[PDB]
Each structure stands twice: as structure tokens, then as C-alpha cells.
Amino acid sequence: FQGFTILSKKTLHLGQTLYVVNGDLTEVRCDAVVHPTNGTMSFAGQVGGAIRAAAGAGVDAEVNSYMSEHSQLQVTKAAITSGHNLPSKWIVHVHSPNYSNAATATDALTQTIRNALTLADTKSIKTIAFPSIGSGNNHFPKHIAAQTILQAISAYFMSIMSSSIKEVYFVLFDQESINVYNAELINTN
């Protein structure tokens, strides 16, 4: 519908490629999209509302059933459901931490990203699209969040034998967040 622009692309040491893209996360054709959420797996805010709108009411049944079987999504943890009417096959729901005046806030965000990627590997996901995580309701400053997330991804790929994940897209809707991710990608290797 709206289309996309690729503002930056960078390949990491062992060949995974990260992209900073302007567009609508729910329009990307990829294996998985990331849904930052809370312990009750709500679809709230700009990103969560858009995901639910595009996925359709069918996702509600699946998320509600997931909680019947698995209880709430604990902080830093991830869970996968189908994407329903989304053009991506899976939704990776992640419970990101809130920012706090402690180094533990960035550690927890690192673990959230590591857990999301690890779970995505279990499905042999090849391409995965992230919104800007941690900025917004979780209140991380934008640069700190982007640094933490990009470094967690770089470190993930250097901490496993191999991964199915070949491409990671940061799909951002505002110039401010594009500028932040573009700047931090330069320091991501």
C-alpha cells in the first residue's frame, strides 16, 4: 500500500543483514514481525493497534488461548503466534522491560532481544521485522534503546553455532527514529 524506503543496510560479520526502513511494519512480507507487549499480551499503542488491525480479530482467540495454556508473558520473555491476516507468517510477542534508573534496565532489554531471536530460530525464521522497541511506554531514551538492541543482535549472531535468521528489518515510521537507528547501525558490526 504505502511502500517502503531503505535508508541504510549493513551486513554483520557472518553475513546477516540489518536494514533501516521507513514504512508500515504490518505491510512487510517477512517470516515474522515483533510485537512489543506486556504480561497480558495486549495490543495497545500505535504499533500494537496496527498489528491487531492488520492481523484481524482471529489473533485475539489465539493469544487468549496461549494465555490459557502458558499464563502471562513474563518480562524479557517471548512467545510466537500465527500472523493471521498479516503478510508475515508469525508474530513474535515480547515483554520488554520498562526503563529504570539502573543498569538492570538495559540488561533486561538485551535479554528481551536475545530471547526473541532465540525463539525465532526455533521456527527457522529467515526474515524478521522489528519496530522501535523500548521507546514509548517503556520510556527508554531512543539512542540507549537502539544501541542496546543493535548490540544484542550483533552479539546474538556471534554467540550461536548458526542461525536461520538472514535479514532483520527495523521498520520505523518517524524521521527521528530513523536518524537514531541510522547513527547506531554505523557502530554495529
- Residue 19's contacts (CB-CB under 8 Å, 6 or more residues apart) are 6, 8, 9, 167, 168, 169, 170
Which helix or strand (DSSP H or E) is residue 182 part of? Answer: helix 175-186
Cα(67)–Cα(86) distance, rounded to whole angstroms? 21
- Residue 28's contacts (CB-CB under 8 Å, 6 or more residues apart) are 4, 21, 87, 88, 129, 169, 171
Name the experiment that determined this structure: X-ray
Q: Nearest Cα to 16, choosing from 181, 185, 121, 154?
A: 154
85 is in an annotated binding site: no
Cα(3)–Cα(48) distance, rounded to whole angstroms? 20
Contact indicator for 91, 123 with CB cutoff of 8 Å = no
- Residue 132's contacts (CB-CB under 8 Å, 6 or more residues apart) are 142, 145, 146, 170, 172, 177, 181
CA torsion sign for 172, 20, 1, 29 is negative
CA atoms within 13 A on the CB side of 98: 5
Amino acid at 115: N
The DSSP call for residue 55 is: H
Resolution in A: 1.3
- DSSP for 101-114, written as a single string: SSTHHHHHHHHHHH
> Greatest CA span in the chain, whole angstroms?
43
Amino acid at 177: S
24 is in an annotated binding site: yes
175 is in an annotated binding site: no
134 is in an annotated binding site: yes
Residue 173, judged by CB atoms within 10 A of its CB (0-12, 13-18, 19+), counts as middle
Cα(58)–Cα(40) distance, rounded to whole angstroms? 17
- Residue 42's contacts (CB-CB under 8 Å, 6 or more residues apart) are 48
138 is in an annotated binding site: yes
- Tally of CB atoms within 10 A around 50: 18
Beta 78-82 vs 90-95: how paired, if at all?
Answer: antiparallel
Contact indicator for 95, 85 with CB cutoff of 8 Å = no
137 is in an annotated binding site: yes
96 is in an annotated binding site: yes
| Residue 116 grid cell | 526473541
- Residue 24's contacts (CB-CB under 8 Å, 6 or more residues apart) are 1, 2, 50, 171, 173
Task: List, in sequence order, the alpha helices (H) in 24-164.
Answer: 45-55, 58-70, 104-122, 142-157
